[PDB]
Design a protein around this nucleic acid. Structure first.
Length: 80
DNA sequence: TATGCCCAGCATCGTTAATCGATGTATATATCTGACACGTGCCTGGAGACTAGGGAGTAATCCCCTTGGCGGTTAAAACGCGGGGGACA
């Protein structure tokens, strides 16, 4: 928490938490097992996509088509 | 003397014209009532003007409450089948 008490803080947290804790990496049985890997994907927007990336953040053509439902999903659509 | 013949005589029918009166239609006049606008008079309940103060506006922060997402059971909704008893004539 505190910037300069943090050492004081983990002096209390590291010494106490460990017992009832176990931290151990794979570095085991993974030597046989074939390798792990992950790739990201940058996909840019489409045609009908912007329409509903742009119009949805307002109630322009989101209210023209399915306007009755617009109301409940309006926040649903925003950040979730 | 009785019976056909001459000379009036009012009522029968119809038609013309003047007259009192009823009906229909204007036409300018004298009431009837029902006013709505104005001036008469007066009251003050509003308008007009100024003040003083505290409500309410707004802005800045907080933190609680409302919405959300998710997944497990476990009751509830859903369905149908069947036949009885209430609706309806």
């Amino acid at each position: 928490n505190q910037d300069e008490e943090q050492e004081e803080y983990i002096h209390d947290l590291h010494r106490r938490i460990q017992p009832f804790i176990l931290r151990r990496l794979k570095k085991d049985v993974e030597k046989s097992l074939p390798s792990k890997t992950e790739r990201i994907l940058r996909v840019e927007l489409s045609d009908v996509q912007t329409e509903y990336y742009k119009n949805i953040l307002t109630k322009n053509y989101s209210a023209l088509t399915a306007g009755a439902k617009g109301g409940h999903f309006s926040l649903l659509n925003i950040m979730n």
